[PDB]
Coordinates of C-alpha atoms in Angstrom, one line a residue:
Chain T
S1 CA -34.8 -48.9 -55.5
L2 CA -33.7 -50.0 -59.0
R3 CA -33.5 -46.5 -60.6
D4 CA -31.6 -45.3 -57.5
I5 CA -28.7 -47.6 -58.0
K6 CA -28.4 -47.0 -61.8
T7 CA -27.7 -43.3 -61.2
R8 CA -24.9 -44.1 -58.8
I9 CA -23.4 -46.6 -61.3
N10 CA -23.6 -44.0 -64.1
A11 CA -22.0 -41.2 -62.0
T12 CA -19.2 -43.5 -60.7
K13 CA -18.5 -44.7 -64.3
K14 CA -18.0 -41.1 -65.4
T15 CA -15.6 -40.4 -62.4
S16 CA -13.8 -43.6 -63.2
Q17 CA -13.3 -42.4 -66.8
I18 CA -11.9 -39.0 -65.6
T19 CA -9.4 -40.7 -63.2
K20 CA -8.2 -43.2 -65.9
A21 CA -7.5 -40.4 -68.4
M22 CA -5.6 -38.4 -65.8
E23 CA -3.5 -41.5 -65.1
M24 CA -2.5 -41.7 -68.8
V25 CA -1.4 -38.0 -68.9
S26 CA 0.5 -38.2 -65.6
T27 CA 2.4 -41.3 -66.9
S28 CA 3.5 -39.3 -69.9
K29 CA 4.8 -36.4 -67.8
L30 CA 6.5 -38.7 -65.4
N31 CA 8.6 -40.5 -68.1
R32 CA 9.6 -37.1 -69.7
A33 CA 10.5 -35.4 -66.3
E34 CA 12.7 -38.4 -65.4
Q35 CA 14.5 -38.2 -68.7
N36 CA 14.9 -34.4 -68.3
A37 CA 16.4 -34.9 -64.9
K38 CA 18.8 -37.5 -66.2
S39 CA 19.8 -35.0 -68.8
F40 CA 20.8 -32.5 -66.1
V41 CA 22.3 -35.2 -63.8
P42 CA 25.7 -35.4 -65.8
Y43 CA 25.8 -31.6 -65.5
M44 CA 25.3 -32.0 -61.7
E45 CA 28.1 -34.7 -61.4
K46 CA 30.5 -32.7 -63.6
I47 CA 29.9 -29.4 -61.8
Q48 CA 30.0 -30.8 -58.3
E49 CA 33.4 -32.4 -58.8
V50 CA 35.1 -29.5 -60.5
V51 CA 33.5 -26.8 -58.2
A52 CA 34.7 -28.8 -55.1
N53 CA 38.3 -29.4 -56.4
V54 CA 38.7 -25.8 -57.6
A55 CA 37.1 -24.5 -54.4
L56 CA 39.7 -26.2 -52.1
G57 CA 42.7 -24.3 -53.5
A58 CA 43.4 -21.0 -51.6
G59 CA 39.7 -20.6 -50.9
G60 CA 39.5 -19.9 -47.2
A61 CA 36.9 -21.9 -45.0
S62 CA 35.8 -18.5 -43.5
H63 CA 34.3 -17.7 -46.9
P64 CA 30.7 -16.4 -46.6
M65 CA 29.2 -19.5 -48.3
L66 CA 31.1 -22.0 -46.2
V67 CA 31.6 -20.4 -42.7
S68 CA 28.9 -20.6 -40.1
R69 CA 27.2 -17.4 -38.9
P70 CA 25.6 -17.5 -35.3
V71 CA 22.0 -18.5 -36.1
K72 CA 19.3 -15.9 -35.5
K73 CA 17.0 -16.4 -38.6
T74 CA 16.7 -19.5 -40.9
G75 CA 15.0 -19.7 -44.3
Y76 CA 12.7 -22.6 -45.2
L77 CA 12.2 -23.5 -48.9
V78 CA 9.1 -25.7 -49.4
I79 CA 8.2 -27.3 -52.7
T80 CA 4.6 -28.2 -53.4
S81 CA 2.1 -28.9 -56.1
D82 CA -0.2 -26.4 -57.8
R83 CA -3.1 -28.8 -58.2
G84 CA -4.8 -31.6 -56.2
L85 CA -5.5 -35.3 -56.3
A86 CA -1.8 -35.8 -55.6
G87 CA -2.5 -38.4 -52.8
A88 CA -0.6 -37.2 -49.7
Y89 CA 2.3 -35.6 -51.5
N90 CA 1.7 -32.1 -50.2
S91 CA 0.2 -33.1 -46.8
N92 CA 3.2 -35.2 -45.7
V93 CA 5.7 -32.4 -46.6
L94 CA 3.6 -29.5 -45.2
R95 CA 3.0 -31.5 -42.0
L96 CA 6.7 -32.5 -41.7
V97 CA 7.9 -28.9 -42.1
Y98 CA 5.1 -27.5 -39.8
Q99 CA 5.9 -29.9 -37.0
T100 CA 9.6 -29.4 -37.5
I101 CA 9.5 -25.6 -37.1
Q102 CA 6.9 -25.5 -34.4
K103 CA 8.6 -28.2 -32.2
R104 CA 12.0 -26.6 -32.7
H105 CA 10.7 -23.1 -32.1
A106 CA 7.2 -21.8 -32.7
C107 CA 8.5 -18.2 -32.3
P108 CA 7.1 -16.1 -35.2
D109 CA 10.1 -13.9 -35.6
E110 CA 12.8 -16.6 -36.1
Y111 CA 11.3 -18.6 -39.0
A112 CA 10.9 -17.4 -42.6
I113 CA 9.0 -19.5 -45.2
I114 CA 9.6 -19.6 -49.0
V115 CA 6.9 -21.7 -50.7
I116 CA 6.7 -22.9 -54.4
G117 CA 3.1 -24.1 -54.9
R118 CA -0.4 -22.9 -54.4
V119 CA -1.6 -25.5 -51.9
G120 CA 1.5 -24.8 -49.8
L121 CA 0.9 -21.1 -49.9
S122 CA -2.8 -21.7 -48.9
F123 CA -1.8 -23.8 -45.9
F124 CA 0.8 -21.3 -44.8
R125 CA -1.6 -18.3 -45.2
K126 CA -4.2 -20.0 -43.0
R127 CA -1.4 -20.7 -40.4
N128 CA -0.3 -17.0 -41.0
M129 CA 3.4 -17.7 -41.0
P130 CA 5.1 -15.2 -43.4
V131 CA 6.1 -16.0 -46.9
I132 CA 9.1 -13.9 -48.0
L133 CA 9.0 -15.2 -51.6
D134 CA 6.6 -17.0 -53.8
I135 CA 6.1 -18.5 -57.3
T136 CA 3.4 -20.7 -58.8
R137 CA 2.0 -22.4 -61.9
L138 CA 5.4 -23.4 -63.2
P139 CA 5.4 -25.3 -66.6
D140 CA 5.4 -29.1 -66.2
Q141 CA 8.8 -29.0 -67.9
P142 CA 10.7 -26.4 -65.7
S143 CA 13.7 -24.7 -67.3
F144 CA 16.7 -23.1 -65.6
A145 CA 15.8 -19.5 -66.5
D146 CA 12.4 -19.7 -64.9
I147 CA 13.6 -20.8 -61.4
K148 CA 16.8 -18.7 -61.8
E149 CA 14.8 -15.7 -60.8
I150 CA 13.7 -17.2 -57.5
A151 CA 16.9 -19.1 -57.0
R152 CA 18.9 -15.8 -57.4
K153 CA 16.5 -14.0 -55.0
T154 CA 16.7 -16.7 -52.3
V155 CA 20.5 -17.1 -52.5
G156 CA 20.6 -13.2 -52.7
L157 CA 18.9 -13.2 -49.3
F158 CA 21.5 -15.6 -47.9
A159 CA 24.5 -13.9 -49.6
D160 CA 23.5 -10.4 -48.5
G161 CA 23.3 -11.8 -44.9
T162 CA 19.5 -11.6 -44.2
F163 CA 19.6 -15.3 -43.4
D164 CA 22.0 -17.3 -41.3
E165 CA 21.0 -20.8 -42.4
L166 CA 18.9 -22.3 -45.2
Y167 CA 16.8 -25.5 -45.7
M168 CA 14.9 -27.4 -48.4
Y169 CA 11.9 -29.7 -47.9
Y170 CA 11.3 -31.7 -51.1
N171 CA 9.7 -35.1 -51.8
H172 CA 12.3 -37.4 -53.5
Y173 CA 11.9 -40.1 -56.2
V174 CA 13.0 -43.5 -55.0
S175 CA 10.4 -45.6 -56.9
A176 CA 7.4 -45.5 -59.1
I177 CA 5.3 -47.1 -56.4
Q178 CA 6.6 -45.1 -53.4
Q179 CA 8.3 -41.8 -52.6
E180 CA 9.9 -40.2 -49.6
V181 CA 9.8 -36.8 -47.8
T182 CA 13.3 -35.5 -47.4
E183 CA 15.2 -32.5 -45.8
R184 CA 18.5 -30.9 -46.7
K185 CA 20.5 -27.8 -45.5
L186 CA 21.1 -25.6 -48.6
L187 CA 23.6 -23.2 -47.0
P188 CA 26.2 -23.0 -45.5
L189 CA 28.1 -25.4 -47.8
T190 CA 30.2 -28.1 -46.0
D191 CA 30.9 -30.9 -48.5
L192 CA 34.6 -29.9 -48.5
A193 CA 37.4 -32.5 -48.4
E194 CA 41.0 -33.1 -49.6
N195 CA 41.4 -32.8 -53.4
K196 CA 43.6 -35.9 -54.3
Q197 CA 43.8 -34.2 -57.8
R198 CA 44.2 -30.5 -58.2
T199 CA 43.2 -28.3 -61.2
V200 CA 44.2 -24.6 -60.9
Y201 CA 42.3 -21.4 -61.7
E202 CA 44.1 -18.4 -63.2
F203 CA 47.0 -17.1 -61.2
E204 CA 46.2 -13.4 -61.3
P205 CA 42.7 -13.1 -59.7
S206 CA 42.0 -13.6 -56.0
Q207 CA 40.1 -16.9 -55.9
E208 CA 37.5 -15.6 -53.3
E209 CA 35.9 -13.4 -56.0
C210 CA 35.9 -16.4 -58.4
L211 CA 34.2 -18.4 -55.6
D212 CA 31.5 -15.7 -55.4
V213 CA 30.8 -16.4 -59.0
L214 CA 31.1 -20.2 -59.1
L215 CA 29.7 -21.4 -55.7
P216 CA 26.4 -19.4 -55.8
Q217 CA 26.0 -20.9 -59.3
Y218 CA 26.4 -24.4 -57.8
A219 CA 23.9 -23.6 -54.9
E220 CA 21.4 -22.5 -57.5
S221 CA 22.0 -25.7 -59.6
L222 CA 21.3 -27.7 -56.4
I223 CA 18.0 -25.9 -55.9
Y224 CA 17.1 -26.7 -59.6
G225 CA 18.0 -30.4 -59.1
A226 CA 15.8 -30.6 -56.1
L227 CA 12.9 -29.0 -58.1
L228 CA 13.4 -31.5 -61.0
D229 CA 13.1 -34.4 -58.5
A230 CA 10.2 -32.7 -56.8
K231 CA 8.2 -32.3 -60.1
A232 CA 9.0 -35.8 -61.3
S233 CA 8.0 -37.3 -57.9
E234 CA 4.8 -35.2 -58.0
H235 CA 3.9 -36.8 -61.3
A236 CA 4.7 -40.2 -59.9
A237 CA 2.6 -39.4 -56.7
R238 CA -0.3 -38.3 -58.8
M239 CA 0.1 -41.3 -61.1
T240 CA -0.1 -43.8 -58.2
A241 CA -2.8 -41.9 -56.3
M242 CA -5.0 -41.7 -59.5
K243 CA -4.3 -45.4 -60.2
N244 CA -5.4 -46.4 -56.7
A245 CA -8.4 -44.1 -56.9
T246 CA -9.4 -45.8 -60.2
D247 CA -9.1 -49.2 -58.4
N248 CA -11.4 -48.0 -55.6
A249 CA -13.9 -46.7 -58.2
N250 CA -13.8 -50.0 -60.1
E251 CA -14.4 -52.1 -56.9
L252 CA -17.4 -49.9 -55.9
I253 CA -18.9 -50.2 -59.4
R254 CA -18.7 -54.0 -59.1
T255 CA -20.5 -54.1 -55.8
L256 CA -23.2 -51.8 -57.1
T257 CA -23.7 -53.8 -60.3
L258 CA -24.2 -57.0 -58.2
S259 CA -26.9 -55.3 -56.1
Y260 CA -28.6 -53.8 -59.2
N261 CA -28.7 -57.2 -60.8
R262 CA -30.2 -58.8 -57.7
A263 CA -32.8 -56.0 -57.4
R264 CA -33.9 -56.3 -61.1
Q265 CA -34.0 -60.1 -61.0
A266 CA -36.1 -59.9 -57.8
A267 CA -38.5 -57.5 -59.5
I268 CA -38.8 -59.7 -62.6
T269 CA -39.5 -62.8 -60.5
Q270 CA -42.2 -60.9 -58.6
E271 CA -43.8 -59.9 -61.9
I272 CA -43.7 -63.5 -63.1
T273 CA -45.4 -64.6 -59.8
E274 CA -48.2 -62.1 -60.4
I275 CA -48.7 -63.4 -64.0
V276 CA -49.0 -67.0 -62.5
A277 CA -51.4 -65.8 -59.8
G278 CA -53.6 -64.0 -62.4
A279 CA -53.5 -67.0 -64.7
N280 CA -54.8 -69.5 -62.1
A281 CA -57.2 -67.0 -60.5
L282 CA -59.0 -66.5 -63.8
Chain U
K1 CA -38.2 -15.6 -76.3
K2 CA -34.9 -13.7 -76.7
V3 CA -33.7 -14.1 -73.0
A4 CA -35.2 -17.6 -72.2
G5 CA -33.8 -19.2 -75.3
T6 CA -30.2 -18.2 -74.4
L7 CA -30.8 -19.2 -70.7
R8 CA -31.6 -22.8 -71.8
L9 CA -28.2 -23.0 -73.5
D10 CA -26.3 -21.7 -70.5
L11 CA -27.9 -24.0 -68.0
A12 CA -27.6 -27.1 -70.2
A13 CA -23.9 -26.4 -70.8
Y14 CA -23.2 -26.1 -67.0
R15 CA -25.4 -29.1 -66.1
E16 CA -22.9 -31.5 -67.9
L17 CA -19.8 -29.6 -66.8
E18 CA -20.8 -29.7 -63.1
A19 CA -22.1 -33.3 -63.3
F20 CA -18.4 -34.6 -63.6
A21 CA -16.0 -31.7 -62.9
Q22 CA -17.3 -30.4 -59.6
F23 CA -15.6 -33.3 -57.6
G24 CA -12.1 -32.1 -58.4
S25 CA -11.2 -28.9 -56.5
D26 CA -9.5 -26.9 -59.3
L27 CA -10.3 -26.7 -63.0
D28 CA -9.6 -24.6 -66.1
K29 CA -10.4 -20.9 -65.8
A30 CA -13.1 -21.0 -68.5
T31 CA -14.8 -23.8 -66.7
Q32 CA -14.6 -22.1 -63.3
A33 CA -16.4 -19.2 -65.0
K34 CA -19.1 -21.4 -66.4
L35 CA -19.5 -23.1 -63.0
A36 CA -19.9 -19.6 -61.4
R37 CA -22.6 -18.6 -63.9
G38 CA -24.5 -21.9 -63.4
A39 CA -24.4 -21.6 -59.6
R40 CA -25.7 -18.0 -59.7
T41 CA -28.3 -19.1 -62.3
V42 CA -29.8 -21.7 -59.9
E43 CA -29.7 -19.4 -56.9
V44 CA -31.4 -16.6 -58.9
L45 CA -34.1 -19.1 -59.9
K46 CA -35.0 -19.9 -56.2
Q47 CA -38.4 -18.5 -55.2
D48 CA -40.8 -18.1 -52.2
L49 CA -44.2 -19.7 -51.5
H50 CA -47.5 -18.2 -52.9
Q51 CA -45.8 -15.0 -54.1
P52 CA -46.1 -15.0 -58.0
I53 CA -43.9 -12.6 -59.8
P54 CA -45.4 -10.7 -62.8
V55 CA -43.7 -11.4 -66.2
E56 CA -42.5 -7.8 -66.5
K57 CA -40.1 -8.2 -63.6
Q58 CA -39.1 -11.8 -64.6
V59 CA -37.7 -10.7 -67.9
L60 CA -35.8 -7.9 -66.2
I61 CA -34.2 -10.3 -63.7
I62 CA -33.4 -13.0 -66.3
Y63 CA -31.9 -10.2 -68.6
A64 CA -29.8 -9.0 -65.7
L65 CA -28.6 -12.6 -65.2
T66 CA -27.8 -13.6 -68.8
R67 CA -26.1 -10.3 -69.7
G68 CA -23.8 -10.8 -66.7
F69 CA -24.5 -7.9 -64.3
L70 CA -24.5 -10.3 -61.3
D71 CA -20.7 -11.2 -61.3
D72 CA -19.8 -8.7 -58.6
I73 CA -22.6 -10.0 -56.2
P74 CA -22.0 -13.1 -54.0
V75 CA -24.2 -16.3 -54.3
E76 CA -25.7 -16.1 -50.8
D77 CA -26.8 -12.4 -51.2
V78 CA -28.7 -13.0 -54.5
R79 CA -32.2 -13.7 -52.9
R80 CA -31.7 -10.2 -51.4
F81 CA -30.5 -8.6 -54.6
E82 CA -33.9 -9.7 -56.1
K83 CA -35.8 -8.5 -53.1
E84 CA -34.3 -5.0 -53.1
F85 CA -34.3 -4.7 -56.9
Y86 CA -38.0 -5.4 -57.4
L87 CA -38.8 -2.6 -54.9
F88 CA -36.4 -0.3 -56.8
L89 CA -38.2 -1.4 -60.1
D90 CA -41.5 -0.1 -58.7
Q91 CA -39.9 3.0 -57.3
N92 CA -38.2 3.7 -60.8
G93 CA -38.7 2.3 -64.3
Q94 CA -42.5 2.1 -64.6
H95 CA -42.4 3.1 -68.4
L96 CA -40.2 0.0 -69.1
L97 CA -42.9 -2.2 -67.5
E98 CA -45.7 -0.4 -69.4
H99 CA -44.0 -1.0 -72.8
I100 CA -43.6 -4.7 -71.9
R101 CA -47.2 -5.0 -70.6
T102 CA -49.0 -4.3 -73.9
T103 CA -46.3 -4.5 -76.6
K104 CA -44.8 -7.8 -75.4
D105 CA -41.5 -6.3 -76.4
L106 CA -38.1 -5.7 -74.8
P107 CA -37.3 -2.0 -74.1
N108 CA -34.4 -0.1 -75.6
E109 CA -31.1 -1.6 -74.3
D110 CA -29.6 1.8 -73.4
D111 CA -32.3 2.6 -70.9
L112 CA -32.5 -0.9 -69.5
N113 CA -28.8 -0.9 -68.7
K114 CA -29.1 2.6 -67.2
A115 CA -31.8 1.3 -64.9
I116 CA -29.8 -1.8 -63.7
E117 CA -26.6 0.3 -63.2
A118 CA -28.5 2.7 -61.0
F119 CA -29.9 -0.1 -58.8
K120 CA -26.4 -1.5 -58.5
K121 CA -25.4 1.9 -57.1
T122 CA -28.1 1.5 -54.4
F123 CA -27.7 -2.2 -53.3
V124 CA -25.3 -3.0 -50.4
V125 CA -23.2 -6.1 -50.7
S126 CA -22.6 -8.3 -47.6
Chain N
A1 CA -47.0 -27.6 -39.3
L2 CA -43.7 -26.6 -40.7
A3 CA -44.6 -23.2 -42.2
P4 CA -43.3 -19.7 -41.1
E5 CA -46.8 -18.8 -40.0
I6 CA -47.2 -21.9 -37.8
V7 CA -43.8 -22.2 -36.2
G8 CA -42.3 -18.7 -36.7
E9 CA -39.3 -17.6 -38.7
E10 CA -36.6 -18.4 -36.2
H11 CA -37.7 -22.1 -36.0
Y12 CA -38.3 -22.5 -39.8
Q13 CA -35.0 -21.2 -41.0
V14 CA -33.4 -23.9 -38.7
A15 CA -35.5 -26.8 -39.8
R16 CA -34.5 -26.2 -43.5
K17 CA -30.9 -25.3 -42.9
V18 CA -30.3 -28.5 -40.9
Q19 CA -32.0 -30.6 -43.6
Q20 CA -29.7 -28.9 -46.2
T21 CA -26.5 -29.9 -44.4
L22 CA -27.5 -33.6 -44.0
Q23 CA -28.5 -33.8 -47.7
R24 CA -25.1 -32.5 -48.7
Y25 CA -23.4 -35.0 -46.4
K26 CA -25.1 -37.9 -48.3
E27 CA -23.5 -36.5 -51.5
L28 CA -20.1 -36.3 -50.0
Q29 CA -20.2 -39.9 -48.5
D30 CA -19.8 -41.3 -52.1
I31 CA -17.0 -39.2 -53.3
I32 CA -15.0 -39.6 -50.1
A33 CA -15.3 -43.4 -50.5
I34 CA -13.4 -43.0 -53.8
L35 CA -11.0 -40.2 -53.2
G36 CA -10.9 -40.0 -49.4
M37 CA -11.4 -37.3 -46.8
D38 CA -8.0 -35.7 -47.6
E39 CA -9.3 -34.5 -51.1
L40 CA -12.4 -32.5 -49.9
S41 CA -12.1 -28.8 -49.2
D42 CA -13.9 -25.8 -47.8
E43 CA -17.7 -26.2 -47.8
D44 CA -17.4 -30.0 -48.2
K45 CA -15.0 -30.4 -45.2
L46 CA -17.3 -28.5 -42.8
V47 CA -20.4 -30.3 -44.0
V48 CA -19.0 -33.7 -43.0
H49 CA -17.7 -32.1 -39.8
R50 CA -21.1 -30.6 -38.8
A51 CA -23.3 -33.4 -40.2
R52 CA -21.6 -36.0 -37.9
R53 CA -22.3 -33.8 -34.8
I54 CA -25.9 -33.0 -35.9
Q55 CA -26.6 -36.6 -36.7
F56 CA -25.6 -37.6 -33.1
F57 CA -27.2 -34.6 -31.3
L58 CA -30.7 -35.6 -32.7
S59 CA -30.4 -38.7 -30.3
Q60 CA -32.0 -38.5 -26.9
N61 CA -32.2 -40.5 -23.7
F62 CA -36.0 -41.4 -23.3
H63 CA -37.6 -41.5 -19.8
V64 CA -38.9 -45.0 -20.8
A65 CA -35.3 -46.2 -21.7
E66 CA -34.3 -46.6 -18.0
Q67 CA -35.4 -50.3 -18.2
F68 CA -33.4 -51.2 -21.3
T69 CA -30.4 -49.2 -20.1
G70 CA -29.3 -47.8 -16.7
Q71 CA -29.6 -44.1 -17.8
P72 CA -31.8 -41.3 -16.5
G73 CA -34.1 -39.6 -19.1
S74 CA -34.8 -36.0 -20.1
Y75 CA -37.4 -33.5 -21.3
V76 CA -36.2 -30.7 -23.6
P77 CA -38.1 -27.4 -24.2
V78 CA -38.5 -26.3 -27.8
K79 CA -36.5 -23.2 -27.2
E80 CA -33.5 -25.2 -25.9
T81 CA -33.8 -27.4 -29.0
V82 CA -33.9 -24.5 -31.5
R83 CA -31.0 -22.7 -29.7
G84 CA -29.1 -25.9 -29.5
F85 CA -29.2 -26.8 -33.2
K86 CA -28.5 -23.1 -34.0
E87 CA -25.4 -23.3 -31.8
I88 CA -24.2 -26.5 -33.5
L89 CA -24.7 -24.9 -37.0
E90 CA -22.9 -21.8 -35.9
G91 CA -20.0 -23.9 -34.7
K92 CA -19.4 -22.4 -31.3
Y93 CA -18.9 -25.9 -29.8
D94 CA -17.0 -27.5 -32.7
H95 CA -14.0 -28.4 -30.5
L96 CA -15.9 -30.9 -28.3
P97 CA -15.4 -34.6 -29.2
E98 CA -18.1 -36.2 -31.4
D99 CA -18.5 -39.0 -28.8
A100 CA -20.0 -36.6 -26.4
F101 CA -23.1 -35.6 -28.5
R102 CA -24.6 -39.1 -28.3
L103 CA -27.8 -39.8 -26.2
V104 CA -28.0 -36.3 -24.6
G105 CA -30.6 -33.7 -23.7
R106 CA -29.1 -30.2 -23.9
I107 CA -25.8 -28.5 -24.9
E108 CA -24.9 -28.0 -21.2
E109 CA -24.9 -31.8 -20.7
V110 CA -22.6 -32.2 -23.7
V111 CA -20.2 -29.7 -22.2
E112 CA -20.3 -31.7 -19.0
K113 CA -19.6 -35.0 -20.8
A114 CA -16.7 -33.4 -22.8
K115 CA -15.2 -32.0 -19.6
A116 CA -15.1 -35.4 -18.0
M117 CA -13.3 -36.7 -21.2
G118 CA -10.6 -34.1 -20.7
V119 CA -11.5 -31.0 -22.7
Chain F
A1 CA -15.3 -83.5 -40.6
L2 CA -12.1 -81.5 -39.9
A3 CA -13.1 -82.0 -36.2
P4 CA -9.9 -81.7 -34.2
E5 CA -10.2 -85.1 -32.7
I6 CA -11.3 -87.0 -35.8
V7 CA -8.3 -85.9 -38.0
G8 CA -5.9 -86.0 -35.1
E9 CA -4.6 -83.0 -33.2
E10 CA -1.4 -83.2 -35.2
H11 CA -3.3 -83.3 -38.5
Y12 CA -5.6 -80.6 -37.2
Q13 CA -2.7 -78.3 -36.2
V14 CA -0.7 -78.8 -39.4
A15 CA -3.8 -78.1 -41.5
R16 CA -4.7 -74.9 -39.6
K17 CA -1.1 -73.6 -40.0
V18 CA -1.4 -74.3 -43.8
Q19 CA -4.8 -72.4 -44.1
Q20 CA -3.5 -69.5 -41.9
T21 CA -0.4 -69.3 -44.2
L22 CA -2.5 -69.1 -47.4
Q23 CA -5.0 -66.6 -45.9
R24 CA -2.2 -64.3 -44.8
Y25 CA -0.7 -64.6 -48.3
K26 CA -4.1 -63.6 -49.8
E27 CA -4.0 -60.3 -47.9
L28 CA -0.2 -59.8 -48.0
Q29 CA -0.1 -59.8 -51.8
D30 CA -2.6 -56.9 -51.8
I31 CA -0.3 -55.1 -49.4
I32 CA 2.6 -55.8 -51.8
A33 CA 0.5 -54.6 -54.7
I34 CA -0.4 -51.3 -53.1
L35 CA 2.9 -50.6 -51.2
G36 CA 5.6 -53.0 -52.3
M37 CA 7.7 -56.0 -51.4
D38 CA 10.5 -53.7 -50.3
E39 CA 7.9 -52.1 -48.0
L40 CA 7.7 -55.4 -45.9
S41 CA 10.0 -56.7 -43.3
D42 CA 11.8 -60.1 -43.2
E43 CA 9.3 -62.4 -41.6
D44 CA 6.4 -61.3 -43.9
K45 CA 9.0 -61.9 -46.7
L46 CA 9.5 -65.5 -45.5
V47 CA 5.7 -66.0 -45.4
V48 CA 5.4 -65.1 -49.1
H49 CA 8.3 -67.4 -49.9
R50 CA 6.7 -70.2 -48.0
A51 CA 3.2 -69.5 -49.5
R52 CA 4.7 -70.0 -53.0
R53 CA 6.1 -73.3 -51.9
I54 CA 2.7 -74.4 -50.5
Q55 CA 0.7 -73.4 -53.5
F56 CA 3.1 -75.3 -55.9
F57 CA 3.4 -78.4 -53.8
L58 CA -0.4 -78.7 -53.5
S59 CA -0.3 -79.5 -57.2
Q60 CA -0.1 -83.2 -58.2
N61 CA 0.8 -85.5 -61.0
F62 CA -1.8 -88.1 -62.1
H63 CA -3.0 -90.8 -64.7
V64 CA -5.6 -88.6 -66.5
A65 CA -2.7 -86.2 -67.3
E66 CA -1.1 -89.1 -69.2
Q67 CA -3.4 -88.4 -72.1
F68 CA -3.1 -84.6 -71.7
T69 CA 0.6 -84.2 -71.1
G70 CA 2.2 -87.7 -70.8
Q71 CA 3.6 -87.5 -67.3
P72 CA 3.3 -90.9 -65.5
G73 CA 1.3 -90.1 -62.3
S74 CA 1.7 -90.5 -58.6
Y75 CA -0.1 -91.9 -55.4
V76 CA 0.1 -90.5 -51.9
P77 CA -1.4 -91.9 -48.6
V78 CA -2.6 -89.4 -46.0
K79 CA 0.2 -90.1 -43.5
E80 CA 2.7 -89.2 -46.2
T81 CA 0.7 -86.0 -47.1
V82 CA 0.9 -84.8 -43.5
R83 CA 4.5 -85.9 -43.0
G84 CA 5.7 -84.0 -46.1
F85 CA 3.8 -80.8 -45.4
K86 CA 5.0 -80.8 -41.8
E87 CA 8.6 -80.8 -43.1
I88 CA 7.9 -78.0 -45.6
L89 CA 6.3 -76.0 -42.8
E90 CA 9.5 -76.0 -40.9
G91 CA 11.2 -74.6 -43.9
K92 CA 14.7 -76.2 -43.9
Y93 CA 14.0 -77.4 -47.5
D94 CA 13.5 -73.8 -48.8
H95 CA 16.8 -74.1 -50.8
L96 CA 15.1 -75.9 -53.6
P97 CA 13.7 -73.4 -56.2
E98 CA 10.0 -72.7 -56.6
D99 CA 10.2 -74.1 -60.1
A100 CA 11.0 -77.6 -58.7
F101 CA 7.7 -78.1 -56.9
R102 CA 5.5 -77.6 -59.9
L103 CA 3.8 -81.1 -60.0
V104 CA 5.0 -83.8 -57.6
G105 CA 3.9 -86.7 -55.4
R106 CA 6.2 -86.8 -52.4
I107 CA 8.9 -84.4 -51.0
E108 CA 11.4 -87.1 -52.0
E109 CA 10.2 -86.8 -55.6
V110 CA 10.9 -83.0 -55.3
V111 CA 14.4 -84.0 -54.2
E112 CA 14.9 -86.2 -57.2
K113 CA 13.6 -83.5 -59.6
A114 CA 15.6 -80.6 -58.2
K115 CA 19.1 -81.9 -58.2
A116 CA 18.7 -83.4 -61.7
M117 CA 17.3 -80.1 -63.1
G118 CA 20.5 -78.2 -62.2

């Protein structure tokens, strides 16, 4: 009936307005987060190339950050949203890590999960797999000091020897339209190669202690880089998901308006037919 | 007049907030609170068939609702909170009802809160 | 005739609770058309889940149908009906495939169909 | 009256391949809009390249447009229409840019326009 379709049109128009507004604000956070990441990208390029060339000289490959340890337990960092409507951003990465761990070994003792994000923590809790560490509701502009606490804890776990290998499962920003699930080993560190050019540390201190300062600092900076791309790609994923959802809302409103117009015009033409039938009958 | 006037404001404010914001899963804290108060409000206003409730025990349930004594209790259990409370209110609190019967007046707030807090000692949550 | 006096409390609670789940499913059908199934959670996920199965299990093979279709018909007692819909609402049989619940008499027949489909 | 016999099974088969190409383009640009061009493989990529050639070559140059824009006009018999589109459907002529096809009579007129343009 006519007054049935109008309520559906009105409610959909309100949801369409909510989705458009959230598209605007996600666009603003996407552009800022990409600029912020590009601000820390020269820091990553500079640090990576100095830490590698310094790390080669008299730093033994048996060093705890570089040498393998026979694998008993592995840590899984998983980076996830704190809020919904993000399309399939969380589901594609939770599902990828869930299948990866279960189909490599579902044994409860070997895996150890570390999750950044409420919907990730919610899925893992229903599954019951343990979460050694957690943090949530990070500011949309994340700063190094915030995630230094968790970064220093997780690397503290690897450095003290409680983990033998470490992984990260972040979505990655390739385009505004489309983004990819990705996986990287965090430690042990094996980008080592010949220097070509050599810059020397101080001669008096044993370089292995200096490595214990500088290489954990790099591993942390690698976590932070991954988090920056994760938050930027989240704001991209929400922007595209909210944009597509607005398109679906608009199409539906069109179809409903066509049916509402047809129903009203049918009612008015019936009314006019009654007026004619009265006018000749009298 | 005192309790029903504020109840109209509460339910109008949540009618609009729920009409749009319920579809999204998570909202602002202050809105999750107002959504909780509206859901409890509609559940506490459900009633049975051919069982009129005297005005004396209506004002005491609406007062318990608006002043926010029902936050601890779950939404499903409320139709039992009412059931077990009206029995308690005929086992204890007869003077409150007597003042309301002829005066048309809300009893002293110290004694009304003492009554509701004692019942909340007796009632067992699922 | 629906009235706790006329049908009894066990039968009444079930008539209303089933109507309550199907009415919520109509509300969810619109929002899933915009956002998708992936966006619903908790009480909205399980309503679509149980409202599909209930909507199919209200379908039955009539004894007069054997001329339109090759099938044998059934007669179902009221007790098996009220237990059946209670069991679907509890969710004891949630694992069975939604195909199985179509044109069937009792929950035992649904288990037999689902066994032949590899449960 | 597009009956397969009446047009001729060669005219019929060419016409159906043109219509199939434009219908696939109609859906395929929605897939490009929601996912992307770089989300599509090579053959689909060739279909969008061909569909752009088909849509522009379907445009024509005529006498009424002498008042509106001053271009002289063209005339085409049906055997020339089918011949030219058959050669475009094979796709060897795809080296000419999409800009060249904008308003033309015969594929040979496209040849004259393209080389001169640069």
